[PDB]
Amino acid sequence: LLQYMFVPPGAPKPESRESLAWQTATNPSVFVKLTDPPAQVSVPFMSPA
Amino acid sequence: DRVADVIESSIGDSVSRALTQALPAPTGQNTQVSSHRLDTGEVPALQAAEIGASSNTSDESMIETRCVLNSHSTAETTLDSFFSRAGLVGEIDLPLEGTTNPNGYANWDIDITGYAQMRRKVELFTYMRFDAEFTFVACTPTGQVVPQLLQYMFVPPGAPKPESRESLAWQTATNPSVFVKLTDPPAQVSVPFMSPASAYQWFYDGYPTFGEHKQEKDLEYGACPNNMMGTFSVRNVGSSKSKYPLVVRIYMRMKHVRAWIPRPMRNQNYLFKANPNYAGNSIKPTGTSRTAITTL
Amino acid sequence: EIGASSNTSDESMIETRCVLNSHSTAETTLDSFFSRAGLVGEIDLPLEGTTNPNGYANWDIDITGYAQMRRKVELFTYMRFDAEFTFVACTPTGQVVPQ
Amino acid sequence: HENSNSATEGSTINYTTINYYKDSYAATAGKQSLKQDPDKFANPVKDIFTEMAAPLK
Amino acid sequence: HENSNSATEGSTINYTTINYYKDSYAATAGKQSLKQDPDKFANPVKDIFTEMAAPLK
Amino acid sequence: GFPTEPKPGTNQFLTTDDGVSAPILPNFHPTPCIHIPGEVRNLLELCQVETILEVNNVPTNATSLMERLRFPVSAQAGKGELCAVFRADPGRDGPWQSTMLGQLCGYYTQWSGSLEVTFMFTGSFMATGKMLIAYTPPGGPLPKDRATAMLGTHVIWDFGLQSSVTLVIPWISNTHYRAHARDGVFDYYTTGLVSIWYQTNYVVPIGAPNTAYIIALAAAQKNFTMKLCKDTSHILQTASIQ
Amino acid sequence: GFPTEPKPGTNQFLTTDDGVSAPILPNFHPTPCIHIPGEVRNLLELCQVETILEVNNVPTNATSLMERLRFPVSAQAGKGELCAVFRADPGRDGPWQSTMLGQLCGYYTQWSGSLEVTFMFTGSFMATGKMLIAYTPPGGPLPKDRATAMLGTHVIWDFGLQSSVTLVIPWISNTHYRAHARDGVFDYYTTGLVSIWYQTNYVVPIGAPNTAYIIALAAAQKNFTMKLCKDTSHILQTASIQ
Amino acid sequence: GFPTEPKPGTNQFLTTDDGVSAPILPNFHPTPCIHIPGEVRNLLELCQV
Amino acid sequence: ATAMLGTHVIWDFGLQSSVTLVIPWISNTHYRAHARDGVFDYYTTGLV
Amino acid sequence: SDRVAQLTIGNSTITTQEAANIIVGYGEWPSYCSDDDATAVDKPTRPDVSVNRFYTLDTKLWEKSSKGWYWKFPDVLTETGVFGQNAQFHYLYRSGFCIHVQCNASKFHQGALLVAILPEYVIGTSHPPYKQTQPGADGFELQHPYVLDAGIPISQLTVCPHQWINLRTNNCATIIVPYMNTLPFDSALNHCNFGLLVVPISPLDFDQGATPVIPITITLAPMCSEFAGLRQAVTQ
Ligand SMILES: CCCCCCCCCCCC(=O)O
Ligand SMILES: [Ca+2]
Ligand SMILES: [Ca+2]
Ligand SMILES: [Ca+2]
Ligand SMILES: [Ca+2]
Ligand SMILES: [Ca+2]
């Protein structure tokens, strides 16, 4: 089992396999098993420009 | 027949004065053209925060501004758009060896003040009414997906709490239970706003006992029964040993949020659960410090 | 002594005020109550033992075998209804087997 | 037909959600209406002055 | 078109359920109507008195 | 096939989930439903019915378990005697255990509404008297004086043809609903206390029992409503069903 | 059955996915929602409120942590003294850490809008003066002269009945939105700098404090808007909750 | 539940498959699209050059 | 703290040097006789 | 016509000549309970004038070193005046308040006092005593004003009904707050809806010679007082 977490620029980046940052209370995270099909994700145009 | 005093007396107005109306605001305010202005009696900049009001001075009255059409939406800065995000709030451990959770079962107390991330955000307001969606991530201390079966049972306050891996309480004839394999995806659950109080209370400035409040009983100051949702029980569905070292992580997301009174953010490191106690022996500044207020 | 529950109302007892009871009584209904899954049966097909060898088992259809459920149901004398049964098969440990 | 039990019940805001079950609280958070009131916290003063005017008369 | 075989058949209460199969009993319990009659058990007396009146005349 | 994307909860089994399931008997038809007396629609229809309240629940001789239902009332002599006291919480392990209403509450987590409790005098017809039945709202400690008890919601009762008399406990709470009170902290949902005192005295002629009994019946008012639910904690099976 | 064909993402669990889930309590009804004062609708309602800005954040004695809120302003003598300087970035680890607005930004990645910062003089009433508060737009290095600082957006302030005075930082950027500036490269989103100089001098009569203080309050303008979001980097828990 | 019968291709991941996917940022709004010179619509616009 | 339990009025100093306190006729009788200690205090208007 | 002001409630009247106006908590006036928000089935008591009046209780001395003080409204008033009685005799309580913290000085003095309101004011320290959580009259004092003894930054307290008493301008603050709680009524004997904090952000200073006795008095007044659940008299 794994956990993919997106860390926007300015957000706390995980420092260890058990860093507090993985609580992902705000950031968007996805948990998946290698037995389940690949992760499907949609991402909007995010940029100051 | 009337003393007149009874006729005048407004006593009994369930209607609040208000004096402040909520208006639509999809796009941030759009700036408008502004030319120079030199006159007496008009002091936009000059204010007096001594009153307790945030300066109402606008850009235009400060500098010769241009015109701008703010298309920037403010839909992501809303309650739901904010709180409605899954986050770690619970974590149970059912190991094979140890003193923590032997026997194969575990009764977790329903409280989310156990984790920073989530606790920080929520403690921003004083009251909060809402529904939630909980997800359950069960796995071994390594990340190993095991073919084990479990049973999550909700135990409302006042209901029989399981005492053993095979306690009668697991028949769950009334209580709501969920059976899942660690091979199947996490559990999806919707939970309605359940509480005698119209809204959950983050801070309770009082005692729930109404007694003497002796020193040994100061363990109650701040404890609000309106936030007591009972407990959460989990165990392996069997008569023998689990055969596997398991660890369940509870995640929560809020739906239909309704926050009220706002308070200052957290300044210190949390120490206890449901306790605003802080590190008194070593307090740190709200933010970063410099070498001189005249140097960057 | 007549066999009737006192019909006395709060108003005639104390100077009451006015209250708008919004409290719904939809969860205190029959379906809203009984319509909740519960343990009523339990079969054992072990490898060793005298209980269920041979590999098969004939269970008698009766739910009076478990407290929790039996308590609620025995509240009434008669009862008409449909039901939905769920079957949880597993080994005495919680082991999920490809059987 | 569905039940009316979703916290934000009788709420002034209009939420357009999706629900497959009988209870409305199981429904998603969905799209909502954008209203604001910076004054209840910024200018909760009894009397109002305006920028052009001097706060203390 | 479906069958009419769900216990609460010809029932006075109006149940709004969801069913995917031919038999109506496979349908969910769904939302129902809220009716009551505390009298059939509380005041199953032949004659009625009222609070203001004395039970035994 | 059709593009699908199963979300969390897939293959999970929820105890209290209202869903459909394949029929086992295609075209089956249940035996016609004959008309049967006293049918029930809602549980609150029962909470209206008064059931014997075991105030005098001290005895447990197993030979004296029947006197738990009754109540003692002798011919005192002093002014302001205390006759009985008990919790005002229905779903509590107190005397409200006997009452039907009480047992039902064990299946629900919270409630709301006023409560009625009628008292019937069984003593001889010649037996006269007057008593003050008080109800001390939450926060008020058990009164020690018949004078300190009458400061709350009370009601004087006289004996005669109308043996019975009902005391209504007005739902006086800070919260819309109350959770079953249980001592530590969870007393924040206590409904208060109920005391009984001698307004005058158990007057009796020459030739009638010098001691009589009273029976308490409890029930809920119309404004009563329960919410949520759970397994009862009022009873637990020790041995497995044979 | 019905022809389906599950696509990628099946059985996956997304933290920020808005979806449905089976109800745990069929026919449950939440306690009525009473009316409660000061309810909030949007977070930008808070960014409007001014909070104390810790410019003088140098002291950390733990006994002198309270003077981080105030600000020193003595009776200088020379022409063109510099009183204070600080970053113009809200979500930066600078002085904007104290401000409510600042703490909120930590939960968002980008922003937009002008910013207001009112300064209130606390010194004696007899204390007079005039000062130039400047704002050097991005690209402009910290000015060294009160004459080099006034080349940007500034505002002279006089002392009197109107103790306070607000300086508005007009959103002057090359991009519609700005990312929280943090030194290396990510300074491309710096909002500039803010300097304070003595236009004249802290004039005081004979008998009044020879040194006074000022308090800075910061907030965002109406044209302010945040986008995206994330976990705060302004604070991190060292030890686990007990 | 509803009678379904997954057909071949289930859980498969096609590189060039146009489908939907759960959003990572509920209620997100991309920075306004300013007008920029020489925008392209079709590749055949280049083959002309 | 024991004096403010009755009819009072806080006064601040400034341009408006003066300030007036009104003693509301609070009596049990329509008219009052001049109070003079012994018994005839039944007509006392109180204290300030 | 904005600095001068007068407050008249019950049989009490307040004056000022340097006021900085009045602030209404979250822009809402104290209202009574609706017949739908209440669950307490019994007509409460609205004594009005007898309780809804101004009460001048405690006073403190501002110094060049003072840290700050705080009070717990629901409890503070109890034990005093007709109000206290209803609060002790009745179980359920409901009311809004009008607070007036006055503190004058001369034009040669300097100082800035922050006076704000904080709902459900809980404190930390591993558990504070009853003499610290409910210091009714004479209140209590802050030891760590920077974190409000709760672990929260004071630099962010302005996000609540507040006001300033900058000696160089005004000499008193005034706030009005409506009942606040997730319930219609609630016993004030054991629960305080909120608290008042008075902290010097700008250290009181003045050249020697000028009267160093700078008192800070507290005066409050209940509004729309409603009490229910009449019973025996209780204290805590
Ligand atoms: C069924 C989920 C309900 C979630 C409610 C969580 C409330 C926890 C707050 C604990 C605060 C406290 O106990 O003082
Ligand atoms: Ca005899
Ligand atoms: Ca001097
Ligand atoms: Ca499928
Ligand atoms: Ca004192
Ligand atoms: Ca006290």
mmCIF file of C-alpha atoms in Angstrom, chain F:
data_model
loop_
_atom_site.group_PDB
_atom_site.id
_atom_site.type_symbol
_atom_site.label_atom_id
_atom_site.label_comp_id
_atom_site.label_asym_id
_atom_site.label_seq_id
_atom_site.Cartn_x
_atom_site.Cartn_y
_atom_site.Cartn_z
ATOM 1 C CA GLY F 1 -18.423 -1.999 -21.493
ATOM 2 C CA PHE F 2 -19.438 1.215 -19.736
ATOM 3 C CA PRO F 3 -16.727 3.418 -18.129
ATOM 4 C CA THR F 4 -17.003 2.974 -14.357
ATOM 5 C CA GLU F 5 -14.649 3.833 -11.485
ATOM 6 C CA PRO F 6 -15.540 2.131 -8.151
ATOM 7 C CA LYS F 7 -14.989 4.455 -5.188
ATOM 8 C CA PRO F 8 -14.057 3.665 -1.558
ATOM 9 C CA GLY F 9 -16.489 1.417 0.284
ATOM 10 C CA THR F 10 -16.628 -1.079 -2.557
ATOM 11 C CA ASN F 11 -17.483 -4.608 -1.404
ATOM 12 C CA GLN F 12 -17.985 -3.326 2.136
ATOM 13 C CA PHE F 13 -20.897 -4.527 4.252
ATOM 14 C CA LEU F 14 -22.733 -1.982 6.392
ATOM 15 C CA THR F 15 -25.086 -3.280 9.079
ATOM 16 C CA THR F 16 -27.485 -0.359 8.769
ATOM 17 C CA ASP F 17 -27.371 0.149 5.003
ATOM 18 C CA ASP F 18 -30.717 0.206 3.194
ATOM 19 C CA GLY F 19 -30.153 -1.432 -0.180
ATOM 20 C CA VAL F 20 -31.549 -3.956 -2.639
ATOM 21 C CA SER F 21 -30.744 -7.644 -3.031
ATOM 22 C CA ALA F 22 -31.620 -10.344 -5.565
ATOM 23 C CA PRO F 23 -34.933 -12.149 -4.856
ATOM 24 C CA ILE F 24 -34.795 -15.811 -3.852
ATOM 25 C CA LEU F 25 -38.303 -16.671 -5.039
ATOM 26 C CA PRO F 26 -39.363 -15.254 -8.425
ATOM 27 C CA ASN F 27 -43.106 -14.529 -8.456
ATOM 28 C CA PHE F 28 -43.658 -15.440 -4.802
ATOM 29 C CA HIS F 29 -46.735 -14.124 -2.999
ATOM 30 C CA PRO F 30 -46.953 -13.793 0.812
ATOM 31 C CA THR F 31 -50.021 -15.169 2.561
ATOM 32 C CA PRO F 32 -52.724 -12.458 2.705
ATOM 33 C CA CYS F 33 -52.322 -10.156 5.704
ATOM 34 C CA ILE F 34 -55.366 -10.706 7.921
ATOM 35 C CA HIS F 35 -56.501 -7.872 10.177
ATOM 36 C CA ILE F 36 -55.111 -8.184 13.705
ATOM 37 C CA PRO F 37 -56.015 -6.070 16.784
ATOM 38 C CA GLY F 38 -53.680 -3.545 18.377
ATOM 39 C CA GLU F 39 -51.126 -2.987 15.629
ATOM 40 C CA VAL F 40 -48.184 -0.671 16.308
ATOM 41 C CA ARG F 41 -46.832 2.069 14.041
ATOM 42 C CA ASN F 42 -44.282 3.995 16.084
ATOM 43 C CA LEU F 43 -42.411 3.229 19.310
ATOM 44 C CA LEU F 44 -43.400 6.560 20.855
ATOM 45 C CA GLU F 45 -46.882 5.028 21.046
ATOM 46 C CA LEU F 46 -45.580 2.885 23.898
ATOM 47 C CA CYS F 47 -43.741 5.629 25.774
ATOM 48 C CA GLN F 48 -47.206 7.131 26.250
ATOM 49 C CA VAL F 49 -48.328 4.091 28.242
ATOM 50 C CA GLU F 50 -47.627 4.205 31.972
ATOM 51 C CA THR F 51 -45.714 1.315 33.540
ATOM 52 C CA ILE F 52 -44.883 0.520 37.173
ATOM 53 C CA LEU F 53 -41.882 2.510 38.393
ATOM 54 C CA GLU F 54 -39.727 0.665 40.925
ATOM 55 C CA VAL F 55 -38.811 3.446 43.345
ATOM 56 C CA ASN F 56 -38.528 1.113 46.327
ATOM 57 C CA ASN F 57 -35.932 -1.019 44.537
ATOM 58 C CA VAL F 58 -33.815 -1.646 47.640
ATOM 59 C CA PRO F 59 -35.111 -5.177 48.483
ATOM 60 C CA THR F 60 -33.596 -8.062 46.475
ATOM 61 C CA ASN F 61 -34.418 -11.075 48.650
ATOM 62 C CA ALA F 62 -35.901 -12.828 45.610
ATOM 63 C CA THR F 63 -38.747 -13.453 48.054
ATOM 64 C CA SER F 64 -39.232 -9.721 48.430
ATOM 65 C CA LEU F 65 -38.763 -8.715 44.794
ATOM 66 C CA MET F 66 -42.486 -8.001 44.559
ATOM 67 C CA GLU F 67 -42.348 -5.156 47.063
ATOM 68 C CA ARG F 68 -39.995 -3.284 44.749
ATOM 69 C CA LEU F 69 -43.113 -2.260 42.826
ATOM 70 C CA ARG F 70 -45.030 -0.945 45.828
ATOM 71 C CA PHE F 71 -44.164 1.882 48.203
ATOM 72 C CA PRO F 72 -44.414 2.456 52.003
ATOM 73 C CA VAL F 73 -46.367 5.313 53.597
ATOM 74 C CA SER F 74 -46.933 5.136 57.355
ATOM 75 C CA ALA F 75 -48.583 7.542 59.784
ATOM 76 C CA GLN F 76 -45.626 9.738 60.717
ATOM 77 C CA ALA F 77 -45.785 12.315 63.503
ATOM 78 C CA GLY F 78 -43.327 15.104 62.745
ATOM 79 C CA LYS F 79 -43.625 18.037 60.357
ATOM 80 C CA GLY F 80 -41.971 17.649 56.963
ATOM 81 C CA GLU F 81 -40.984 13.981 56.674
ATOM 82 C CA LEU F 82 -39.186 12.763 53.552
ATOM 83 C CA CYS F 83 -40.853 9.711 52.030
ATOM 84 C CA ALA F 84 -38.817 8.947 48.911
ATOM 85 C CA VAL F 85 -36.216 10.237 46.474
ATOM 86 C CA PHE F 86 -34.971 9.120 43.060
ATOM 87 C CA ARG F 87 -33.269 10.088 39.805
ATOM 88 C CA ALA F 88 -35.209 11.948 37.121
ATOM 89 C CA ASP F 89 -33.272 10.248 34.308
ATOM 90 C CA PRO F 90 -35.249 7.612 32.306
ATOM 91 C CA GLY F 91 -32.449 5.772 30.528
ATOM 92 C CA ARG F 92 -30.410 5.687 33.727
ATOM 93 C CA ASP F 93 -29.737 2.552 35.776
ATOM 94 C CA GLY F 94 -31.970 4.062 38.449
ATOM 95 C CA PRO F 95 -35.576 3.024 39.304
ATOM 96 C CA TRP F 96 -36.615 3.861 35.731
ATOM 97 C CA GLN F 97 -35.293 0.427 34.836
ATOM 98 C CA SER F 98 -38.679 -1.190 35.446
ATOM 99 C CA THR F 99 -40.697 1.271 33.361
ATOM 100 C CA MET F 100 -41.319 0.290 29.743
ATOM 101 C CA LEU F 101 -40.187 3.756 28.693
ATOM 102 C CA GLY F 102 -36.904 3.239 30.512
ATOM 103 C CA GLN F 103 -36.148 -0.067 28.796
ATOM 104 C CA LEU F 104 -36.853 1.461 25.391
ATOM 105 C CA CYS F 105 -34.429 4.335 25.968
ATOM 106 C CA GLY F 106 -31.639 1.791 26.255
ATOM 107 C CA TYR F 107 -32.019 1.400 22.499
ATOM 108 C CA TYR F 108 -31.632 5.122 21.843
ATOM 109 C CA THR F 109 -28.835 7.545 22.659
ATOM 110 C CA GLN F 110 -30.729 10.806 23.141
ATOM 111 C CA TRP F 111 -34.230 12.047 23.939
ATOM 112 C CA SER F 112 -36.501 15.052 24.500
ATOM 113 C CA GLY F 113 -39.836 15.882 26.099
ATOM 114 C CA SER F 114 -41.649 16.128 29.426
ATOM 115 C CA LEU F 115 -42.484 13.128 31.608
ATOM 116 C CA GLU F 116 -45.625 12.180 33.529
ATOM 117 C CA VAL F 117 -45.659 10.022 36.659
ATOM 118 C CA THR F 118 -48.974 9.161 38.309
ATOM 119 C CA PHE F 119 -49.138 8.026 41.945
ATOM 120 C CA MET F 120 -51.978 5.853 43.211
ATOM 121 C CA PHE F 121 -52.841 5.410 46.886
ATOM 122 C CA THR F 122 -53.861 1.850 47.786
ATOM 123 C CA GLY F 123 -54.435 2.348 51.504
ATOM 124 C CA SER F 124 -57.828 2.044 53.171
ATOM 125 C CA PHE F 125 -60.612 4.393 52.084
ATOM 126 C CA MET F 126 -60.689 5.957 55.549
ATOM 127 C CA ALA F 127 -57.037 6.938 55.134
ATOM 128 C CA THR F 128 -56.683 10.691 54.543
ATOM 129 C CA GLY F 129 -53.682 12.892 53.832
ATOM 130 C CA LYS F 130 -51.827 15.556 51.864
ATOM 131 C CA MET F 131 -48.345 15.381 50.361
ATOM 132 C CA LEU F 132 -45.923 17.602 48.474
ATOM 133 C CA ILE F 133 -44.283 15.966 45.456
ATOM 134 C CA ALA F 134 -41.377 18.113 44.280
ATOM 135 C CA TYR F 135 -39.054 18.156 41.272
ATOM 136 C CA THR F 136 -35.695 19.885 41.675
ATOM 137 C CA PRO F 137 -34.437 20.914 38.200
ATOM 138 C CA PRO F 138 -30.834 20.073 37.186
ATOM 139 C CA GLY F 139 -28.155 21.804 39.226
ATOM 140 C CA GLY F 140 -30.212 21.695 42.398
ATOM 141 C CA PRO F 141 -28.859 19.308 45.078
ATOM 142 C CA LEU F 142 -31.187 16.925 46.916
ATOM 143 C CA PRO F 143 -33.241 19.130 49.281
ATOM 144 C CA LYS F 144 -33.068 18.404 53.003
ATOM 145 C CA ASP F 145 -36.170 20.360 54.007
ATOM 146 C CA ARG F 146 -39.752 20.078 52.789
ATOM 147 C CA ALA F 147 -39.386 23.854 52.759
ATOM 148 C CA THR F 148 -36.264 23.713 50.588
ATOM 149 C CA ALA F 149 -37.864 21.199 48.229
ATOM 150 C CA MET F 150 -40.961 23.282 47.472
ATOM 151 C CA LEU F 151 -38.745 25.942 45.874
ATOM 152 C CA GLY F 152 -38.839 23.950 42.656
ATOM 153 C CA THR F 153 -41.619 22.482 40.533
ATOM 154 C CA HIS F 154 -43.968 20.698 42.936
ATOM 155 C CA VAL F 155 -47.596 19.682 43.429
ATOM 156 C CA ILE F 156 -49.641 19.043 46.582
ATOM 157 C CA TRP F 157 -51.820 15.917 46.575
ATOM 158 C CA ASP F 158 -54.915 15.059 48.618
ATOM 159 C CA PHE F 159 -56.377 11.596 49.216
ATOM 160 C CA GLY F 160 -59.951 10.609 48.410
ATOM 161 C CA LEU F 161 -62.100 9.202 45.605
ATOM 162 C CA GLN F 162 -59.446 10.185 43.075
ATOM 163 C CA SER F 163 -56.808 7.794 44.378
ATOM 164 C CA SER F 164 -54.333 8.678 41.637
ATOM 165 C CA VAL F 165 -52.611 11.972 40.827
ATOM 166 C CA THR F 166 -50.039 12.765 38.151
ATOM 167 C CA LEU F 167 -46.907 14.896 38.362
ATOM 168 C CA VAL F 168 -45.554 16.268 35.108
ATOM 169 C CA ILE F 169 -41.806 16.766 34.755
ATOM 170 C CA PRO F 170 -41.542 19.660 32.273
ATOM 171 C CA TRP F 171 -38.635 19.241 29.881
ATOM 172 C CA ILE F 172 -36.403 21.913 31.394
ATOM 173 C CA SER F 173 -33.002 21.562 29.746
ATOM 174 C CA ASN F 174 -30.250 23.679 28.226
ATOM 175 C CA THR F 175 -29.984 21.340 25.235
ATOM 176 C CA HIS F 176 -32.681 20.361 22.739
ATOM 177 C CA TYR F 177 -31.875 16.703 23.376
ATOM 178 C CA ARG F 178 -30.358 14.859 26.332
ATOM 179 C CA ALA F 179 -27.916 11.957 26.414
ATOM 180 C CA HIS F 180 -28.478 9.207 28.978
ATOM 181 C CA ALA F 181 -26.882 10.478 32.197
ATOM 182 C CA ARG F 182 -24.405 8.149 33.896
ATOM 183 C CA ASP F 183 -22.534 9.813 36.774
ATOM 184 C CA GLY F 184 -19.068 10.990 35.738
ATOM 185 C CA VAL F 185 -19.374 14.021 33.453
ATOM 186 C CA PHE F 186 -22.330 12.521 31.585
ATOM 187 C CA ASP F 187 -24.431 13.979 34.368
ATOM 188 C CA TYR F 188 -24.479 17.150 32.275
ATOM 189 C CA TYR F 189 -27.654 15.511 30.990
ATOM 190 C CA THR F 190 -29.262 14.825 34.363
ATOM 191 C CA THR F 191 -32.967 15.644 34.460
ATOM 192 C CA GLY F 192 -32.816 16.561 38.131
ATOM 193 C CA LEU F 193 -34.296 14.872 41.187
ATOM 194 C CA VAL F 194 -37.688 14.020 42.656
ATOM 195 C CA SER F 195 -38.591 14.177 46.345
ATOM 196 C CA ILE F 196 -41.760 13.374 48.291
ATOM 197 C CA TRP F 197 -42.710 14.905 51.632
ATOM 198 C CA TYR F 198 -45.592 14.783 54.100
ATOM 199 C CA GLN F 199 -47.602 17.991 53.768
ATOM 200 C CA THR F 200 -49.696 16.924 56.766
ATOM 201 C CA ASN F 201 -50.002 13.353 58.076
ATOM 202 C CA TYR F 202 -51.362 9.874 57.335
ATOM 203 C CA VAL F 203 -54.592 10.265 59.330
ATOM 204 C CA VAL F 204 -56.448 7.006 60.001
ATOM 205 C CA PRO F 205 -59.575 6.119 62.043
ATOM 206 C CA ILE F 206 -59.758 3.412 64.701
ATOM 207 C CA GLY F 207 -59.928 0.134 62.819
ATOM 208 C CA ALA F 208 -57.978 0.730 59.628
ATOM 209 C CA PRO F 209 -54.419 -0.332 58.649
ATOM 210 C CA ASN F 210 -51.822 1.876 60.338
ATOM 211 C CA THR F 211 -49.694 1.645 57.194
ATOM 212 C CA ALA F 212 -50.563 1.820 53.495
ATOM 213 C CA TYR F 213 -48.819 1.695 50.121
ATOM 214 C CA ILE F 214 -48.538 3.741 46.933
ATOM 215 C CA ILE F 215 -47.741 2.735 43.355
ATOM 216 C CA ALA F 216 -45.865 4.890 40.855
ATOM 217 C CA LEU F 217 -46.548 4.733 37.121
ATOM 218 C CA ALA F 218 -44.248 6.491 34.658
ATOM 219 C CA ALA F 219 -44.670 7.547 31.033
ATOM 220 C CA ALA F 220 -43.629 10.246 28.566
ATOM 221 C CA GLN F 221 -45.591 13.262 27.350
ATOM 222 C CA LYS F 222 -46.609 13.944 23.751
ATOM 223 C CA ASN F 223 -43.710 16.354 23.233
ATOM 224 C CA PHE F 224 -41.420 13.370 23.828
ATOM 225 C CA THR F 225 -39.043 12.240 21.073
ATOM 226 C CA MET F 226 -36.007 9.946 20.904
ATOM 227 C CA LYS F 227 -33.169 10.120 18.385
ATOM 228 C CA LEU F 228 -30.342 7.870 17.216
ATOM 229 C CA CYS F 229 -30.135 4.363 18.703
ATOM 230 C CA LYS F 230 -27.882 1.598 20.048
ATOM 231 C CA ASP F 231 -27.861 -1.783 21.802
ATOM 232 C CA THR F 232 -29.328 -1.856 25.310
ATOM 233 C CA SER F 233 -26.949 -1.580 28.250
ATOM 234 C CA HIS F 234 -29.762 -2.263 30.721
ATOM 235 C CA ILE F 235 -29.301 -6.015 30.283
ATOM 236 C CA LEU F 236 -26.547 -8.364 29.119
ATOM 237 C CA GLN F 237 -26.560 -12.136 28.584
ATOM 238 C CA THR F 238 -24.108 -13.976 30.826
ATOM 239 C CA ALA F 239 -24.370 -17.469 29.314
ATOM 240 C CA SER F 240 -24.810 -18.415 25.653
ATOM 241 C CA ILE F 241 -28.241 -19.539 24.435
ATOM 242 C CA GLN F 242 -28.682 -23.309 24.641
#
